[PDB]
Symmetry: D2
Subunit: 448 residues, 4 copies
Amino acid sequence: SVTEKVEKFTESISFDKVLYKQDIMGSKAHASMLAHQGLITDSDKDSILRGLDDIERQIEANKFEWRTDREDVHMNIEAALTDLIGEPAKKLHTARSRNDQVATDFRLWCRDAIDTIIVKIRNLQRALVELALKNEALIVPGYTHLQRAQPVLLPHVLLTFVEQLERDAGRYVDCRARLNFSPLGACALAGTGLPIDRFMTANALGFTEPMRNSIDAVSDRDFVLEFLYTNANTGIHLSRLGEEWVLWASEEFGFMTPSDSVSTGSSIMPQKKNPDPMELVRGKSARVIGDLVTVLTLCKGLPLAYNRDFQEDKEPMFDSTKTIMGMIDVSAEFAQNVTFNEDRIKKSLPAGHLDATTLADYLVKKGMPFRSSHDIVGKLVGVCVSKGCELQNLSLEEMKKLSPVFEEDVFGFLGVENSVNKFSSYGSTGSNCVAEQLGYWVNKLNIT
Amino acid sequence: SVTEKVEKFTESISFDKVLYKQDIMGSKAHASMLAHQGLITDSDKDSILRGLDDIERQIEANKFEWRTDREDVHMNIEAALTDLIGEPAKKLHTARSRNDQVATDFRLWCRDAIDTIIVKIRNLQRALVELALKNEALIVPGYTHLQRAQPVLLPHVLLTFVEQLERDAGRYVDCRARLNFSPLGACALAGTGLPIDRFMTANALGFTEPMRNSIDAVSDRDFVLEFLYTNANTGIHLSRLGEEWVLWASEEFGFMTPSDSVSTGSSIMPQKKNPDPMELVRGKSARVIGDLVTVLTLCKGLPLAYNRDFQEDKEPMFDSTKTIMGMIDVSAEFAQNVTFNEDRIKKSLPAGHLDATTLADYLVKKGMPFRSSHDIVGKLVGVCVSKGCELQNLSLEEMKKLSPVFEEDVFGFLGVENSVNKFSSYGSTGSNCVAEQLGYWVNKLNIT
Amino acid sequence: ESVTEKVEKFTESISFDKVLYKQDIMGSKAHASMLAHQGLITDSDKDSILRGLDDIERQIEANKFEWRTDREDVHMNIEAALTDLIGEPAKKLHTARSRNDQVATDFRLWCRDAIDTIIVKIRNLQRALVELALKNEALIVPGYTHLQRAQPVLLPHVLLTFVEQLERDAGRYVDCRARLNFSPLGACALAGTGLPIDRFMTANALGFTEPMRNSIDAVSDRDFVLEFLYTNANTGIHLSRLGEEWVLWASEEFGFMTPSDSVSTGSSIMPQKKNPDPMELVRGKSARVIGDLVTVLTLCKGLPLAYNRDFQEDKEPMFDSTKTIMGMIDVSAEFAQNVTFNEDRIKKSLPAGHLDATTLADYLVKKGMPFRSSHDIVGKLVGVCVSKGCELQNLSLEEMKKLSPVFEEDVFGFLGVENSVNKFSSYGSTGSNCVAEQLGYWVNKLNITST
Amino acid sequence: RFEESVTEKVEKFTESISFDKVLYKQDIMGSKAHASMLAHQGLITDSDKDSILRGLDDIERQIEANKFEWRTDREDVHMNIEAALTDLIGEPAKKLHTARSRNDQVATDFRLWCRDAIDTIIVKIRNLQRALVELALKNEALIVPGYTHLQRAQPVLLPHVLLTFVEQLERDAGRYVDCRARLNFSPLGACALAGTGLPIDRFMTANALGFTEPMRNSIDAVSDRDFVLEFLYTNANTGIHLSRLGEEWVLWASEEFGFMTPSDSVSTGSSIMPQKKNPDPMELVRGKSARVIGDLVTVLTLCKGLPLAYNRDFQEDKEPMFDSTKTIMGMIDVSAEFAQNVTFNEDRIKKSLPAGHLDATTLADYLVKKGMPFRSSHDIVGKLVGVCVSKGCELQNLSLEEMKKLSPVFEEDVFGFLGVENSVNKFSSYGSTGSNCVAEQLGYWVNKLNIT
Ligand SMILES: N/C(=N\CCC[C@H](N)C(=O)O)N[C@@H](CC(=O)O)C(=O)O
Ligand SMILES: N/C(=N\CCC[C@H](N)C(=O)O)N[C@@H](CC(=O)O)C(=O)O
Ligand SMILES: NC(=[NH2+])NCCC[C@H](N)C(=O)O
Ligand SMILES: NC(=[NH2+])NCCC[C@H](N)C(=O)O
Ligand SMILES: O=C(O)/C=C/C(=O)O
Ligand SMILES: [Cl-]
Ligand SMILES: [Cl-]
Ligand SMILES: [Cl-]
Ligand SMILES: [Cl-]
Ligand SMILES: [Cl-]
């Protein structure tokens, strides 16, 4: 059947039912306004409000029957309201279109979602900082080109992700403020000649103020694009977190062991511990980017004002949102269920001459042009490579072959533990510098 | 040769040369800080500053030869500097890596770029508001589903774009603030033991403060992602403006005629005026979306800290920025070179029955319920377009046949001029509301 | 709110991968049959397994089968069910197999089945388009460049454009299916096995062309998913253009097309507003199809060998893309059967625009004029007409002779949109006989009849 | 200071010659074929055709010598060439546009360009396949771990890992062949969108330019950019494969894996840390897969929602396709060079292998072949691996006595199945890592690629 095919193709209730709390809040505000403006009676208002709250209790109770033949969340709720309370229900359509209603509902849902995500992000930040604090003294390699470049403190590495998430949080805060303007009162696109008060409904629904352009009100989906992007950049942070942790849990790296409860394995190979949760965090970054491209492509090239294509805005946003929330929480649980392999890590450090840059710094302190200090440290490392020692084990006499500036104080700058203590610049991996940043984060996240 | 081929593939000068002004700025700051902290001499510093000024001047005069064999902008400048001033140039890279250098320069280039784009947008907002003021009384159909729905004022439609562009500006402003933290002094990834000062360079370069984490400073490209997405959303807006204007320019609409300076024609069919620029504006939103996806995919799943993949960050930001600036400026030129065909728009409006919703509002104000009001107007339009006429041509007698609430004042609410006059909600297309909004924008954009 | 509970909910795939049951069961039976043949299980094990899996297929088809999150995925749901049903022999089904080769085999089969279905749906739409074309076979509309009127074309020529697009689409679908039609089964976790399986037998049993040559490729490859997503996306593009065309044609400004009530919405106070929602949504649905492709491109990029758990994310987007494109195709075909063309509106709009100009130029060139002179003379004459308020065909031969003695009485069979269209003659042109030729080709190839 | 008109500001935005000049060779070939058909069909004189064909050859020679000044005020490649042609030969040049439009001209030119680019890419892919097969041949005996979830799963042969990438690239080559065939139809003679009533022969020009046939629909011929989309997609899939190769080799060149050392000619280093070898070229290969995805999204987004027939938006199809093609050629060629400049660290690889119980599965298969069901065989093997973990030993160090406490089926032939070298010897399924299997596959490839 044609109308049956088209019904199935155009219905949105299968997905848009999740807007129910926002829709009800939006309708209550609309009705309160209508009464205050003299377009309905107080009596009709009290009826609408009590009816809407009854339907809400019914949905919370999983006793509400959603219907395809009723199209969407708005008509499903309006039609049930009418069955419950009679004619007053029909008064909700006064000075209102689904165009402006859906925009209101969807912005309200986004606002609540953003709020939830910020709580989740702070939780992940805390989980990372608690892990940093648990391993504050542990030295690991820092990498460029996935080659060992310099020794860093494990907390400094973890604070990288904590700082990335702070930028994410900042985007979410800016996203929320930009979207917190009311489209309600725009009607189908042009506003109304009826005496509504859009300032009153804006305020009732916690919006900053009403949007100043009704065509903009019904045609705008920037708040969707911005939310999707914010989720995509957040997902990227977590994808790099995931790459990192899948590497650290490999045997080649050997740095991290996940608990049984966040890994899988083999009956016949009992040391194999697969970090499936973080591999899925990495992979789920893909869908979040996909969701963003959807709505970008959707909006491209569309004429004004309202077009049915905009119905396609919701499922990507719901997907993106669900996905990031999962990623954030899973990452936090993973952070709480890993331990570092101190002996394996400490064994691996000596062979990399990670203290070379600290030695070059020593020489630069003593007056040597940097390019000369690097050549000389280069040579010394080659000596250590052939002899199979560390720089720390070279004699002062050996160093004096290359320059007279070397003195006995040089040994305070050699070995990884001394190298780490010698970093001193703001934001560096130095012990006191990392200590300060940790204290800053403890205080900001209210950790105790 | 193997060396030939890897050189060509890894070379970045062919594109990163556009960073020259920022690279020189950053190097003057670093040199001044080195000198202040006793890591180089004042005479070294002075030689470096004059040398760099010389090189900048030579670039501006197109007399500087860029070299593939010098890899990138940083080494191209520093080898030239060495050839100009000798040994002092070689101390410039003390306590500095290309890692922290490039991220600093790119950040500065983005700050400059965002500032330029914000100026371009205000110019386009001005061009739109001026177009609106010139055509303040022109009524056109407002559309849903590309079907005529309500009568609206041309200025109200144009203000939709002005409002969209204002959310864009807000995004540029929020993006610039978040990016304005200094990575300089992170060195390769871990910071340094040399007594630099990161606060002093941050101050000299206009950054709010140093970034708090050295690994984050070298590893982060969020600022690229945020600017690319802001460009993309702006381009989405311009793509809709494009779509509208290709439509308006069509014979089928006949709403607008572009000047010959902004259109192509045909000697055999002299009435064919193609709006090539706006078609290109809509089409160029695609490249800006592609640029965003490039760099999202770039960052996805990369380990810490610096990887050579991050060299791919620059060409997409350059392409996106240049495209959007071109799209903003040609859209303003176009806005300044279009005329509306008032006689043709006027003759099309009557047969719509666009006054129908206004008549319905008239009845709701008289105390009719929503559905009843629609039922009545329903009937009235049949009795009307059965005689190929307009509602305002009906007699009061035939109106009172359908309901007694009709009175003589009803004619004040029929026809599109009256319909437009009767919209009264904030942000509506109503004559007074639109004048209020035009006054707001005239003040905000310092128009005279 | 336990970790095990949180991780279970995040890693479970049964909520979406249950749709592979048919192919999963078909694979497992081919597996068990090969095992028995090769002596790795008894024939009574095989018979016991085939019976059980049929019982389970019936239970699923009857909505009597309880899918379980604690059983993770389709593979483990089914096999745990098989164990509860037949006991010991079910346990032997895992012999010389991994979920790695198993999942790749199942998904390949599902994709081959999905592609066969899409091709049929495309033939349908092609048929609906050619039938609409034949029903409106003599109708003339403007052809557009830059959304400006360029030349007069036959509506059938325009609809055949979309039929030709869809024909390239069907072509990609066939090539895609051919490349994916190689068996991963028997790669095990990634390295293969030392057990005496026969990969040729299972490949043949499952309709695959031959076994894949590399065990590691077999578990790690998702190209078939990428290529099918891309092919859906390009089909989606074509339908988005169709969507945009028809949303314009149903505008009042164009006024070329009226959709039936069954494929439109409207307004009780504005009875002439007819919103073509299905086509707007077809247009809009092309976006999620592009998004699903980007998802899987980004998923695969930069991943090491061989199998990785990120690959679990390949399914939901392929399922979304496939369901979306099938709906887009089916609804377009339905809309093509529920539209009529507003003949008098079209005819009224045509003659202001001078679409016959190029035909008059072609007339002058055949009479010997150089092409540059011909375009200048016709531009001038169209100037005379714009001024006078007329069509070229209403000018007298005396007015044309003012501009060139070349014009003769025969010129009049070259003017007007009906004459214009009859005079196109290049292959693939909008010419009357050309479109007829092309319509015969599609009537033949799609087996269109009048009964 | 020269004050610019509006017309000048707009010309800068809409000019395409800055990028489309790279089509000159296709454009001149298309125009020559056009003129030849014109003369044959009587629409121009043979004298006029000869002048046109000679002027176009001269112009092509001037471009090849870098004596040709491209001009932004001539808009595009088509107009640059034809106005230059008019300046050279005068009036005959003006007959060139008889029965042709830029709409059908550009579509012909870009198809010719794309057909040549695919032909070049196929060659470059065969080269990379050969480089990979020779690296495999030179390292045929070397055993390395095979990973799932970046955890050691099984022992495999290095050649079998490299043949994964050869098999990938063979699918890529198939898509290029299929893509080229589908795009090899001539739009020429569609004119602006509707054809023409002049007596052209579209089959003649199609054959002259190596197309299979003229396209069956004039509107489709000027509106279609499927060939572009399909090429971009094919590039992007190829780029994903090269991104996995990049990821692999960056990991392998790490200290932690320590499997592979690149030559100095394909890596970068550090004077202070002379042992640090960065695989920058393979990092960039991985990175450049991104822009190839971006270029596909560009033209996908571009085509979405556009009405028929030709729109000016379509000029945005050239730059992505040029970028995509250049990038993928670079990634393929550099990958082939990197493959020819790596060596494997045989002692480093070998020292890691023996402690991961990589032989456990091969013991499980031994038990299945002796008649134990799958589930009991894994029970037994998990228990024996359990004893090795505790005793800090390998499986091949267990006694036949200890094993017989779990199951009678154990006999002395069990030790032919244990240890990493035996494990790899025991794989035997078609397409498996067994050495006889891989040998058969290498011979297939050596023959297929005509390696001598
Ligand atoms: N119903 C409607 N828009 C529905 C918005 C809700 C929709 N499910 C969505 O998600 O966009 N608009 C009216 C009014 C109008 O568009 O003029 C109509 O289609 O007639
Ligand atoms: N679980 C697994 N493959 C799962 C394939 C199906 C999965 N639901 C998906 O969707 O990819 N493989 C084994 C074997 C292995 O990877 O070594 C494992 O991870 O332990
Ligand atoms: N360690 C280094 N030399 N890093 C190189 C940084 C500059 C490089 N051209 C880029 O764009 O990222
Ligand atoms: N009507 C025309 N002159 N069309 C121009 C076609 C060539 C154009 N530069 C493109 O790349 O699409
Ligand atoms: O070249 C075009 O876009 C249009 C041609 C025409 O008017 O025939
Ligand atoms: Cl108000
Ligand atoms: Cl100071
Ligand atoms: Cl500092
Ligand atoms: Cl022909
Ligand atoms: Cl086999």
